[PDB]
Design a protein around this nucleic acid. Structure first.
Lengths: 105, 81, 93, 650, 98, 95, 106, 86, 98
DNA sequence: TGGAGAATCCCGGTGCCGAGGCCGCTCAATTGGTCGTAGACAGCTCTAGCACCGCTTAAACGCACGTACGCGCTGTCCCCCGCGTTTTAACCGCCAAGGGGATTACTCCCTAGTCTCCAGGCACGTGTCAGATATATACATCCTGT
DNA sequence: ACAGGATGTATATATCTGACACGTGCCTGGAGACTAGGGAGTAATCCCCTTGGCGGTTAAAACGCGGGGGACAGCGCGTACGTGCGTTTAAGCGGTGCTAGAGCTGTCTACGACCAATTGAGCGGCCTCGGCACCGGGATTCTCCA
């Protein structure tokens, strides 16, 4: 009766991942450990962007992480910015990007 | 009084250039940008309408929007998709 | 009336690193859509690989190949370590 | 085939035989073989309501399914029995020709064999009413007189050639069946059947085929259908536009997987086609055998040496092979016969009437002579030692026995059952077999130290690239002292330590080969020094510079086109006496009967070609004292992998 | 009227709009805008307020990237002012229209 | 026998349909093969996602119409939906 | 028995097309008119590209269509290029151009 | 153990090769400061896909690399080329 | 010895190579380069000659769009000369690397 | 200044050749019938839920001037860049040759679809409370003129 | 030439409304077993891939080199930020309202499964001929002189 998540010792629910694999109809024969791999990767990247989001919120010294903080946490990085390049962000904005000749004479 | 391509105003265009980080503008920017944004949105808005038609809905949700934007490659997080 | 998200599984892993901090519900939805996007992207990619090698079955080797085909190098190295962290930790338990 | 009497045969299966045998014949499960329990059935229309029911709470009926399956089983059984009758009639014709030879057939139909010892009834020879002819063919070169069973075999092949059927010559591989095959083709040359013939054999086995076509039958005009796709295309424009009225070589899948070659050989319209070691012909479920039967030929020959198993698919393959208008018969119901895979619940071979058909089809089409009927003494004396090979037998009881099995290594995840593939690896097992062999291809004389001195005085030569100071050392430190004897001598830049003062004189297998050199020095027993490894071939090149001089290391590349270049320079008394084959070549044809003492310097752990590659030894009348010898060291991996461990009773 | 230097108000507004990430355009003209746009394809369609919010969001986010691009063009063009030829070049590089 | 499938016969068909007096490059024939491969799979990957959005298990020609109305330029659609209705009406009505 | 292509009078393997719809792992069930629809629009695009290919071949006065005809085709119609901006053609090159500063000297 | 090795060759893209590419690039005047840098430009481009390609081949468990491997590589960024079997 | 006006030969060569469709890069050093490149990730792998020709055409077609884009930058830069910053702006605005 | 001539482009005919058409041949896939079920269509209802009115009001929008500052023009100069020459060299031709690696039957077999009970996580409803907005408020710092 | 003024900016109080924790149905991952069929993976074999290897030679490296745009300054100019004063309408709020998604049930038909057959096509091969080099030979051309 043991779930797979605590069996994997993780926090992403692999069973509904398997459910939306099966009814999502991408591969023919769904492997058992393949979503266990997948949701683990998802959990890692979720926590990874969450850490920089919390760092940005700590730089604003506030408790609630906001979409501004998400834009900061995606713009300060480059490889995460590589992965989420074309991703428009709701309430996104961008980092303060001041250029050279935009300064006055 | 107006057609809606003049519903946007050039102070708002200027403030978008402030968020665009642009210092100085010409007197020629505004209607050009208006047409650019107009055709850009009209590219995918008809796609949203065809979505709702294939959804057989006379109402436009937000899901179809970001689906078209995904087919536009303008992907969004924040409203489910 | 029952509708689905991942926001509690977002929430645990939020508390698994920064238990003190809060987050906006807008941002909760943002991360929900974000994990939905990366899940569907990597799944579609791996099923394309499955058609490429003509293997109707799929394993975790396919998922590892998929994230290696999708992620930048440190991200992919971190991801293959994180995926290989708990596979037989699940399986031999 | 009929319907109603076969339906009654299905009925007597479902009403007569045991539950194991009902699951056998009907191909059902034991639960469906019982539902034995639902036996008896007054007819199959009473079995029509006998459908194995769905479970009870607390799509197909079994009737039509089992009736149709066992109906096709029984119609295949009666078609098999028709083949049994046909092969038994034509094997009666075979024994009619045998009694026309006035000669003792020393095997029977009942095991699917044919055997003869000598053609004495030599004393009676050739009778006038016979397909037997005593003399060797004239187009066969008279360098070797074809002996008793050899002349018997060429005349048996001539008999089954006159029968306009296909035949099997299944002698036990020491008998030289390719030799009698080529002698049969020379007899066809002497009986004006001068093409087209076809030979199909693997490329490593084309040694004795093409060399025997060059030596024993040079007057036979042979074409070689071997090469690449464009090379055999060139041969196709050579032979298709018939510029060469030849008499008689491709491989099996080359003549099987490429329709172009299949249709070319179909266009050739042969007369005899010979298949040597047809394991695909040991498989009626092999369509390669189907395409080999699609060769136009009034005679087909099969050359095997394994005794035939009690497998119905094997014997059905051999029966449809030897019988024309049986392969032409569709044999569709024989396919559904084969679908039961000899399971413990449904063992279709151990179905009773299938065992009856195994004994019943068995079959005089199989010319199978054992060696012991027509006997090469197998002198088994193990190697005698010097104290240096067994000195490092314990040194490579440490680098072979590196810690890999029988503890647990650290890993990020709990993967434990995937680490059982390190011991008995390929390099370490050939290094364990070279522990048995000559012992200086280890790191014992130029280990790592003397080879930076080889790289020291190598800079002052044209053989120095932009990066070869460490690189010629790293390519010289992995090669060893045997490999470092044949270039540190020859390259005239580094010769302070060129020869290692010949430690091969005081060696184990070299002095055992030197004990057997008394067969090569003092007597005319020309010796066939087998091996396994090309560095041990370099050893047997260099260790024959001490007492018996070496002429040339026999390269194993006489497989390509009729090559004599290393075998023409042979058959002297002492100075040309040690030529070096291995188990690398095919064991199908023989050379001259002067090379008799085939000596395995490196033994083979398999019993696949040691019956075959020593066909140069087994004979009724080979012209000298013939032995065979194997070099097995007493306690290494060589004595373990030697198949002399134990046996069983029955 | 104390005279300010030009761009200084623009610079602090640049810092404000880089800090603050909220919407810009008024929602009622944008709503009538997307209504008259939607009339081109089917008359009398209804839209979520969240949907047109995401429309305004996606549009602003689309144009500001073009804005930074054209700013970099004028940097390359030795100018602090912009002209619509910069926009033409932007659509040329992205392969939009030109 | 070592077979595979191309579309080169169908490309040649439509070639001799529109221009019977015209040959082609085999290399360009392979371009056309890969081309119609892309043309098939693009609409396929569209319509699958559409059926996921429309919560459907089944894809009919009504899905293909909206699929190409998404993925294609408009005048191409203005000919294409007419040809699709014409072809499906010839398929269904006739025979 | 009419083929499904010939059931619509077409020149495509609509049976094989519908088989690829089955094995293509996209959806579960496949409507019968869907391979008809998609094969029809493939026929439309194939006709549109190959007519222009024959046009440029007549311009090149060539029987066998070279890939540069395909290059010019996708570099002439906007809607073709709107479909095929992301595509590149092997041995195709690019449409010729000389820019305004790039004129030779007067 | 005997194997060869040859890297760099990034200069094997010669400067006149780059000039002829600018001819098909349709540019008249070229500064001297260009021929070095575009070598890197393709490089990160090439290394974006080439190790991706063997990422197929490693999962394909082969040692050679198909042209179809190159197709699947170039499909990942969507720069679709045709006619190499695809 | 006739000397031309500088660039006219380049313009007729622009006509020639926009006319022709064949490859440009020498196959062997390009091949050795990409073989070294793949060797850096994993040593001693094989490919196809068809595969390496596909890489050659893909690379050339990849580069020429950047060439035309930078040409349009130099047009906007009022220059016939092309500079490194033009390519930096190219990869900037298409967002590839810069 | 029109010419002019080497350079350059364009062109009919030469003779392969090599892909391209075209015809055979066998096998596989399709086209057929029938189940069949379940999803999809379609009908029914309804209720949240966009439209869409109207009241007020804040501020963003709109212009005057304005000036100044940023774009444009042109002069120069210079240094870098194309452009014929040479040589050199490496690539291509092409030939060969070998071998690790792609290819395909074969054989399990285990690994993964599938059915049902449940229980237990696990999403929906509902207070709750505390972060962060929301608004003054006195201090640090930087724009704009000394 | 520091200083005056405008604006940031932490300080301090309000409030309130998203976060959250739990009931609470609820349904679904999990077990658990059947089951069966693609995957592993073996093994033996051709073959394309690689490496070398040698001659011919297009073309790249090096060079002159003259001149031509890049640039630099700078003079001018004109238009665009940037105030300050109308302004107006967006928004915020609220009330119908009706209607349309958003479900429900409820029947049904259309595609999935599964065998046949036959012929479309696929591969091999073969023929053959349009174009692709030369190849001199007629027609343009535009950097440099009248």
């Amino acid at each position: 009766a043991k779930s797979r998540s605590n069996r994997a010792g993780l926090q992403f629910p692999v069973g509904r991942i398997h459910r939306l694999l099966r009814k999502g109809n991408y591969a023919e024969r769904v492997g058992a450990g393949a979503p266990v791999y997948l949701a683990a990767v998802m959990e890692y990247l979720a926590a990874e962007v969450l850490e920089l989001a919390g760092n940005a919120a700590r730089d604003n010294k506030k408790t609630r992480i906001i979409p501004r903080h998400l834009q900061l946490a995606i713009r300060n990085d480059e490889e995460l910015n590589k992965l989420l390049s074309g991703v428009t962000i709701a309430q996104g904005g961008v980092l303060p990007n001041i250029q050279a000749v935009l300064l006055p004479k | 009084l107006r057609d809606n391509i003049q519903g946007i105003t050039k102070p708002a265009i200027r403030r978008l250039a402030r968020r665009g980080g642009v210092k100085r503008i010409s007197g020629l920017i505004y209607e050009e940008t208006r047409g650019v944004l107009k055709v850009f949105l009209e590219n995918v808005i008809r796609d949203a309408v065809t979505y709702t038609e294939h959804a057989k809905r006379k109402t436009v949700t937000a899901m179809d929007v970001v689906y078209a934007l995904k087919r536009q490659g303008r992907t969004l997080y924040g409203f489910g998709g | 009336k029952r509708k689905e998200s991942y926001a509690i599984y977002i929430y645990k892993v939020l508390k698994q690193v920064h238990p003190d901090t809060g987050i906006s519900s807008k941002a909760m939805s943002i991360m929900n859509s974000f994990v939905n996007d990366i899940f569907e992207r990597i799944a579609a990619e791996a099923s394309r690989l499955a058609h490429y090698n003509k293997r109707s079955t799929i394993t975790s080797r396919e998922i590892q190949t998929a994230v290696r085909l999708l992620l930048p190098g440190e991200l992919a190295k971190h991801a293959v370590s994180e995926g290989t962290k708990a596979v037989t930790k699940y399986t031999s338990s | 085939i009929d319907t109603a009497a076969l339906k009654e045969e299905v009925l007597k299966y479902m009403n007569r035989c045991s539950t194991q045998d009902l699951a056998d014949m009907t191909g059902c499960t034991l639960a469906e073989a019982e539902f034995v329990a639902k036996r008896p059935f007054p007819d199959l229309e009473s079995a029509l309501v006998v459908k194995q029911p769905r479970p009870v709470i607390p799509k197909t009926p079994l009737g039509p399914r089992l009736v149709g399956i066992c109906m096709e089983i029984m119609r295949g059984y009666f078609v098999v029995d028709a083949l049994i009758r046909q092969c038994e009639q034509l094997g009666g014709k075979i024994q009619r020709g045998i009694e026309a030879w006035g000669l003792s057939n020393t095997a029977t139909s009942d095991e699917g064999e044919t055997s003869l010892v000598n053609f004495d009834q030599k004393s009676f020879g050739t009778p006038a009413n016979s397909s037997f002819i005593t003399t060797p063919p004239a187009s066969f070169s008279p360098d070797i007189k074809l002996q008793d069973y050899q002349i018997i075999g060429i005349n048996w092949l001539y008999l089954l050639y006159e029968l306009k059927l296909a035949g099997i010559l299944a002698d036990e591989m020491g008998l030289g069946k390719t030799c009698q095959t080529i002698a049969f083709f020379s007899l066809l040359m002497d009986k004006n059947i001068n093409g087209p013939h076809l030979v199909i054999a693997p490329a490593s086995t084309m040694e004795n085929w093409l060399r025997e076509f060059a030596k024993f039958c040079p007057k036979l005009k042979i074409e070689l259908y071997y090469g690449s796709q464009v090379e055999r295309e060139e041969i196709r424009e050579r032979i298709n536009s018939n510029k060469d009225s030849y008499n008689v070589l491709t491989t099996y899948r080359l003549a099987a997987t490429s329709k172009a070659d299949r249709l070319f050989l179909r266009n050739q319209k042969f007369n005899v086609c010979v298949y040597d070691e047809g394991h695909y012909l040991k498989n009626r479920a092999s369509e390669r055998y189907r395409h080999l039967m699609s060769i136009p030929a009034d005679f087909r020959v099969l050359l095997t040496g394994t005794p035939l198993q009690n497998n119905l698919k094997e014997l059905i393959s051999l029966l449809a092979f030897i019988l024309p208008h049986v392969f032409d018969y569709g044999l569709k119901s024989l396919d559904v016969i084969f679908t039961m895979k000899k399971s413990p619940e449904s063992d279709f071979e151990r179905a009773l009437l299938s065992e009856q058909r195994v004994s019943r089809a068995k079959a005089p089409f199989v010319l199978r002579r054992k060696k012991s009927q027509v006997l090469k003494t197998r002198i088994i004396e193990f190697c005698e030692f010097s104290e240096e090979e067994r000195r490092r037998y314990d040194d490579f009881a440490s680098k072979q026995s590196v810690n890999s099995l029988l503890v647990m290594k650290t890993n990020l995840d709990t993967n434990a059952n995937l680490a059982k593939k390190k011991s008995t690896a390929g390099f370490v097992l050939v290094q364990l077999r070279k522990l048995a062999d000559h012992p200086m291809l280890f790191r014992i004389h130029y280990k790592d130290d003397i080879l930076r001195q080889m790289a020291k005085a190598i800079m002052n030569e044209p053989q120095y690239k932009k990066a070869n100071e460490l690189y010629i050392f790293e390519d010289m430190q992995y090669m060893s002292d045997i490999e470092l004897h044949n270039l540190c001598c020859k390259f005239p830049s580094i010769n302070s330590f060129q020869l290692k003062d010949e430690p091969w004189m005081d060696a184990t297998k070299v002095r055992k080969l030197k004990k057997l050199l008394t067969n090569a020095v003092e007597n005319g027993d020309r010796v066939v020094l087998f091996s396994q490894f090309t560095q041990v071939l370099d050893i047997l090149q260099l260790v024959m510079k001490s007492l018996n001089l070496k002429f040339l290391r026999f390269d194993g590349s006489t497989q390509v086109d009729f090559r004599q270049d290393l075998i023409d320079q042979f058959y002297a008394d002492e100075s040309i006496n040690v030529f070096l084959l291995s188990t690398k070549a095919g064991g199908f044809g023989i050379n001259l009967a002067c090379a008799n003492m085939v000596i395995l310097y490196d033994v083979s752990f398999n019993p696949f070609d040691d019956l075959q590659a020593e066909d140069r030894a087994h004979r009724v009348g080979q012209k000298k004292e013939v032995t065979v010898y194997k070099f097995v060291v007493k306690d290494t991996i060589e004595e373990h992998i030697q198949r002399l461990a134990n046996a069983k009773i029955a | 009227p104390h005279r300010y230097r030009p761009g200084t108000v623009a610079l602090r507004e640049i810092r404000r709009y880089q800090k603050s990430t909220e919407l810009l355009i008024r929602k009622l003209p944008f709503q009538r805008l997307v209504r008259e746009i939607a009339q081109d394809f089917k008359t009398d369609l209804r839209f979520q307020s969240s949907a047109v919010m995401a429309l305004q969001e996606a549009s602003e986010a689309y144009l500001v990237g073009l804005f930074e691009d054209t700013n970099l063009c004028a940097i390359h063009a030795k100018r602090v002012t912009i002209m619509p030829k910069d926009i033409q070049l932007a659509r040329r590089i992205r392969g939009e229209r030109a």
